[PDB]
Each structure stands twice: as structure tokens, then as C-alpha cells.
Amino acid sequence: VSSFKANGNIEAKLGAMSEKVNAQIESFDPRTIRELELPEGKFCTQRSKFLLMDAMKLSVLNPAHEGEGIPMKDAKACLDTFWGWKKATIIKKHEKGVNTNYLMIWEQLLESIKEMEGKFLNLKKTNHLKWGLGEGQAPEKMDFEDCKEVPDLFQYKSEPPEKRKLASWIQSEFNKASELTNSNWIEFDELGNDVAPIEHIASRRRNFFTAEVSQCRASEYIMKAVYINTALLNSSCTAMEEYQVIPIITKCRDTSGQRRTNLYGFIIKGRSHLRNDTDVVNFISLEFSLTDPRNEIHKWEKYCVLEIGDMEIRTSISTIMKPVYLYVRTNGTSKIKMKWGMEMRRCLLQSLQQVESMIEAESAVKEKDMTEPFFRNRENDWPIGESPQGIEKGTIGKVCRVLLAKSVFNSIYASAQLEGFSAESRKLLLLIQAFRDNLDPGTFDLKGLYEAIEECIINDPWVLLNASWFNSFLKAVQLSMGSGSGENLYFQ
């Protein structure tokens, strides 16, 4: 090494090495390339920790602030507004579960709420409740020597996940997440006073952002996530051995002005001796709904839907009687998942900085604040959806809510599948963008990239829909371009 001197050593072995070892640039054209294949199987089922569009609220007019008053007192206050309960009946069976336990759990809960005298409610460890919360379902830990000789002792099931097909409900769920509501779901804490002129500008723009984000349906889902995961985390830590009851509460302020407390249902925390950050707390989630589960039975694979009452619902025309369903299911979560659920408000930041960078980018060109023109006028609009008529556009407020929904759904349906899909499909998007900028993009192994993407589309409802969204996007880019040597790179 001390006496080595170069003498065409690289060029020599470059000559020796096979010409199979090469990186052939195959020119990339988005008109040539295929759609991503989505897997086959049974349909993908809802896997959120709470109902989204299918939820239903009992509520009271109440001046109490976002986290004020005792949760179970507010729960009992919300129950007292509703009458016309019934003897519960199973209207849709959880195929893998003992469904009489789900019925007995509801009846035990409802009677224990009636009998409670205090701030918290711990349920008695009944046989039906013990089953629902997975009592004693961990195999007992022995030394290997003692159990070495057992026939069916194998290693834990370590297979890839079972593939599932893209159901229509996830697109439907996302549509509702992007909508406005009649209620301000998020309350913001105080700032210091605005002194700087840019601080006054900020706060003017913040006025637009706040109303748009707070009244969006996705923000209701944020506040449900933030409440549930906070309650489950705190109770998991303090009340480890108790089956503690956690009512599903949010609080909001109408656009009319009145403050309101809402009750979606209840959660029964199982035992929660959570050592590792992946360790599971089992819980039962009993949630109100008007949605008939039989219209999409595939959506509710894990749920046992009871029918618990009848509600007289008022409208502009006349009153309607509708049945009240209680979507019961066993479910689970961890310290890491709970922690991230408690921090779901950061979704607001992901949407709004993208929105604000869009507003600011135009403001640089126009050399004035384009905040008010964007929210008040409907001149500047971006493609955000497809109908049978075609590619529909929307205002900056719509984009804010759609991007917010995306970030909330990334949070609710987090997975390794989403991670891998998002990172690999980002390369394919940039290649399409490179072509659209007239920069002559080239791949080396395009098949391998496609496989790296498609490998991650296994079973998750949210990643299946995002894969579908890419295909819809690809087709939209193809039709705008069309055939030609000098085609239509500009959209519309």
C-alpha cells in the first residue's frame, strides 16, 4: 500500500469485467406505463379505534369548556336527553365471537352507570367481560426444558399479512372527512399580543385558517382521537388492574355560538400492565350509530352490532322514527399508538403550511397579501376530486380540509404499508413530474420500483385507497397529455 502507484488499474479491470454489468437508461414516458395492481381477497374492514362517519351523538347544551366537568357526569347528562331505549337484540353477529357476551357487556355497563356513585366507574370482572377484554389469554410462561417435548409447540405465526380488496367505504369515509360542519371542534389557546405588522398579517390569515380547520369534519376526528388516547393512556398507567369505563366525549361550540357536550358511546379499558411500547391494552368500544350494518356487512367484520333503541328524529318536513344501533367490538392499542393519537393536532400544521405556502407563493408574484382574495373570491381553484362529469376543482378552503383529512387519515390508519407505499410511490410521482417539466427522465429498473410500491399494498383500507388515488391521478395525467411528440404538458 505504501509503495503502490496507479497504472491504469481501474481501466484494466473495467476492460476485463462483463458488459452484462451496466446501468441501461430506459426512457420514461407516463403514457406508456401501467396502473398499479391492487390485490384480491375478502374486502378490507374498518380498523379505526372509533366510528368516523357512522358515529352518532347524544348531546346537551352546556357552557362547560373543552375539558371541564367530570366525564361520567357529562356522560349521564347526555344519556338523560334520550328516551326510547329497548331490550337489546343482536342485529349483526361478530362471526368469530361469543355474541351473548357483547349483549351482556352492554347490559352490565348500562346498569353499572345507573348504580355509580362517584367520579370514576370500575366494572366487576364478570365472565362475559373477562372474555371481551382478553383475561388470561396469554399462554403461561415456562422454561423450555419443562415444555421441550410438546408436539404442537411451534414458533409464533410469523407470516406476511393476509391480502384484502379495496372496499368502497374508505373513499366514502374520506369524502365526509373533507366536509364542513356546523360546529367549531377545536379551541385554540391564547397568543401574546400582535405588535409586529407581520404578526397582525399572520393573525388575519390565521382567522381564515382557524374557522376552516376547526369546522372541518376531520377536526372532530382529531378531538375524538386526542380524548380517547389521552383517557386510555392516563387510565392505563394509574388503574392497571381495574376495568375502568371511559365515556367517549367531545365538546364543541356551534356557529350559532352555544357550547355543547357530545356523547358518542363508551370504552371499557381492559388490564393494562404495559411494559414495552408495543404492549397491548385490550378494550371494548360500545358506540352509538344510525347506520344499518347489513347494507355493508363486510365493513364490520370485527363488530357485533346490537339494536338498543328507537329515536324520533326531527326534520324540516316531519318527524321520522329510526332504529338506534350500538356498534360493539373488542379492540386494542399500545403506548406508542396512544402517544401519537394524543398528538393528532399536528395534522392541522401539515395541511395549513401547504395551504399557506400556496398562498404565499402567489403573494410573492402579485407582491401583495393574497390571503383575502383566496378565501373570499373563487378564481384560484385546484383539482381535488373526480365525479362522473369529470375532474372537479375546489377553493383554497376545500384544499385545506382535503389535505387536513389526508393527514388525519394517515394518523388514524398508520401502518408500515403506508410508510413503504408513500416512500416508493414518491419516486414514481417525481418521475412523472420530471417528464412533465420536459426534463427527459430515465429509469434503470422500472419493474423493480413498481414491485417495491406494490409489495406494500397488502390489506390496509387507507393504503389501498391511496394506491387507487395514484391510478386515478395517472389516468388524469394521461388524458390531459394524450398522443403526440409535442403534447399538452399544461393541465387546464
Partner: peptide, 19 residues
């Protein structure tokens, strides 16, 4: 600022039913 969308639900809300 009141945000508004071009969309409706003529009869009732299944999430916030008037009862």
C-alpha cells in the same frame, strides 16, 4: 369569516340527529 361549501344534506344529520 364563515367558511362554506357547495353541498347539502336536505333531511337530517345521522351524526347529529335532531331529537
Amino acid at each position: 369569516y364563515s367558511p362554506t361549501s357547495p353541498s347539502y344534506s336536505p333531511s337530517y344529520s345521522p351524526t347529529s340527529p335532531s331529537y
